Design a binder for this molecule. Structure first.
Ligand code: NA
Ligand code: NA
Ligand code: NA
Ligand code: NA
Lengths: 88, 91
């Protein structure tokens, strides 16, 4: 008995860990791997000519401690905003 | 074709909107509907054998504009924090 919410979150955690495990801390997502993740997972928005600095800017707004990575919470905040074109 | 992330997000929004459409504004979640959602969607963690105050507190924290509802961005911040036991809400 696994709910829709449990299934969806498990998928999000699984994708996040696949990319966070490629460099840096195993539990945070480097900027470079966020870029790769967005191209693979949200391809309808982050395509070939997506401005290289569209991510540079928004990645600064999200990386709270300025360590060059986002944790899962910061990551979900971004994905949720993109999907609803939230102000940020 | 739809990625794991697109599908999961669409699922989270669909569940949120199912409960948000039950009362008040169609696009926001009342406190009572949040409790119902959490018990049905994260039943192992929540339920009726839990503490009401747990929800009065978290609800006040999530309701950024103090209008008595939660938007999806605030809701998903909670769900994500729970699945990782994040310090924001876990004292
Ligand atoms: Na990492
Ligand atoms: Na960081
Ligand atoms: Na509502
Ligand atoms: Na609100």
């Amino acid at each position: 008995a696994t709910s829709d919410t449990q299934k969806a979150m498990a998928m999000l955690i699984a994708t996040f860990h696949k990319y966070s495990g490629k460099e840096g801390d195993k539990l945070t997502l480097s900027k470079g791997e966020l870029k790769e993740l967005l191209s693979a997972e949200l391809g309808d928005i982050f395509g070939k000519t997506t401005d290289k600095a569209a991510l540079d800017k928004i990645f600064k707004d999200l990386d709270a401690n300025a360590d060059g990575s986002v944790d899962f919470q910061e990551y979900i905040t971004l994905i949720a905003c993109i999907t609803m074109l939230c102000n940020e």
